[PDB]
Swiss-Prot record:
S-S pairs: 3-21, 14-38, 42-53, 54-59
High-level lineage: Eukaryota, Metazoa, Chordata, Craniata, Vertebrata
Compartments, record wording: Secreted; Target cell membrane
Alphabetical UniProt keywords: Cardiotoxin, Cytolysis, Disulfide bond, Hemolysis, Membrane, Secreted, Signal, Target cell membrane, Target membrane, Toxin
Protein name: Cytotoxin 3
């Protein structure tokens, strides 16, 4: 699986154990994400802090 980095223009193949891409952002500023990468478990979303998780090459 390939996932995009903070700057979508760049990416990397996920290591063993992390089969999900994620994008972290504040609900009021969806176009200004704060974190992107590979992860093993989709972080829990809250009222203001959301996480987008998917497993399609560079889907984050
Ligand atoms: C002085 C305040 C700092 C503002 C930070 C501006 C956000 C740019 C960081 C790239 C995040 C990714 O964004 S993306 O548009 O490329 O997907
Ligand atoms: C998301 C954090 C980026 C770390 C910046 C370190 C720069 C060194 C480049 C390593 C390339 C090799 O690594 S790779 O993970 O891209 O395959
Ligand atoms: C999880 C739902 C996926 C549906 C995609 C809809 C995009 C949601 C962005 C909110 C718009 C608001 O933000 S604004 O920055 O444009 O004002």
């Amino acid at each position: 699986l390939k996932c995009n980095k903070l700057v979508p223009l760049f990416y990397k193949t996920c290591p063993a154990g992390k089969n999900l891409c994620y994008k972290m952002f504040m609900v009021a500023t969806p176009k200004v994400p704060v974190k992107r990468g590979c992860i093993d478990v989709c972080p829990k979303s809250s009222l203001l802090v959301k996480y987008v998780c998917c497993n399609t090459d560079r889907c984050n």
